[PDB]
């Protein structure tokens, strides 16, 4: 059923986790986490949710842990040349090639969102759709207090509820505090996606945009509300949908997995997959 | 769902592969494999069987890979002190500890079987039951070309082996390619040098000079055409018939988990049923 691979790229190694088994005329669900998380902390709560298993049975689910961000990853040396956000997306075709994966339905959060997008623009042939959670297509004391600051809204983060401290502990303990610095640094070094909404008559600016179907997701109480909204205005509305989730801030995948599973289903039905929908 | 771990022991690292998540009370099914195999080669065919998924979903399955037997394991150095079978069995307690596992239900093949049994004698509090496939409790007595040819003989009966069926060739290629040929020899060496299990059937009249025997429920499994049959039968004779059962699988030889898995799943169900697990049959 499952298998974990350590795949050799030209930008070093990337640790993946295949769950389920795919068919040759059916795609794979590739996942990519945000800064401070891994495939387990980021997605597994959402992915092991009851409503998802009905979906996931039909499509094999592959979870990509970023370089040094996989659990039990050794510390990267001090002067290691950590792959840049753009380079990370350069490492994604090999992952598909290694596992003879013809195409994916991407699911990414924040940095994972950006990296899946870059990849989708670089290789739109290999990407069929994108769920882009809390995506920011523009550029930007304690590293842990910085990532929780990116993840959750001040009210929510200040309130330090069970979620806040739970994931505060994950970041702290689960993820390499050396490799996490280099992955944060990388994300922080990200350039503008430089995607503009197309015009039917004629384009005022010759800017490429996502050809594949896109579901943008952001909590009302998310700090990424403006950034996901910018992105939407810069994306082809014929292929894009914007979901603003109520009573939700950081990690809407875990905060509201019920609401998000329903949308992913509606989204997937739209492409032609899970037509029966139980 | 699944997770791999490279677990530090005092006898070095041991590779393991956890699928599902277990609670405190219910025990986590533990596998240990034979020489020239790994958890993948040995168990995943059997474990991924239809009828098993019904049982295995309900229990967690920690697949242990032997030192330097896990896929993509680097060659050990020339003079590397490779853990003895007893030392291999001492690596198990730290694994339960590392994964906050309370107890296990062991499944072992060949070396796998012996290692779990040494563990079960060391720590009866940790084992609730054992299924032992093609186990040999007695010392080899063959101290001395190609480990692969050696290993094939070990796993498959001469009559079976003479035919050269798809399984003999399939597993002949697996032993060659799957395993680092440096580390295999050492694991083969380590298994061959094994000592007598020192089990003796008790007598009900009076204590049999404080005889030492397994205290957990046991199911010994062997194919009719297996070369291990009289070793397993000896083992059985040396064990408590009250807490033991011997399963002779008809029209079957080496690797019964791979061959006739439906039958073994059914047997393995009844085994689990005896413990008080799986109240209703699937």
Author numbering:
A (entry chain A): 29 to 168, 183 to 320
B (entry chain B): 29 to 172, 183 to 320
Source paper text:
The N-Myc downstream-regulated gene (NDRG) family is a member of the α/β-hydrolase superfamily and is repressed by Myc expression. Although NDRG3 has a high structural similarity to the α/β-hydrolase family, the substitution of the residues of the enzymatic catalytic triad and narrow folded cavity due to the presence of helix α7 and helix α10 indicate that NDRG3 is a nonenzymatic α/β-hydrolase fold protein. The NDRG3 ΔNC structure includes two domains: A canonical α/β-hydrolase fold domain and a cap-like domain. Compared with NDRG2, the helix α6 region of NDRG3 is a flexible loop.
To determine the effect of the residues in forming helix, we constructed a helical wheel model using the helix α6 sequence. The helix α6 model of NDRG3 is amphipathic where the electrostatic surface appears to be analogous to that of NDRG2. Comparing helical propensities of each residue on helix α6 between NDRG3 and NDRG2, Ile171 and Ser176 of NDRG3 overlap with Met165 and His170 of NDRG2, respectively. Based on the helical wheel model, we designed NDRG3 I171M/S176H and C30S/I171M/S176H mutants, which mimicked the helix α6 sequences of NDRG2, and determined the crystal structure of the I171M/S176H mutant at 3.3 Å resolution. The structure of I171M/S176H mutant did not exhibit a clear electron density map in helix α6 region, likewise to that of NDRG3 ΔNC WT. Taken all together, the unfolded helix α6 region of NDRG3 is structurally unique in comparison to NDRG2 or any other α/β-hydrolase fold proteins, and the structure is not only determined by nearby sequences but seems to be influenced by its surrounding environment.
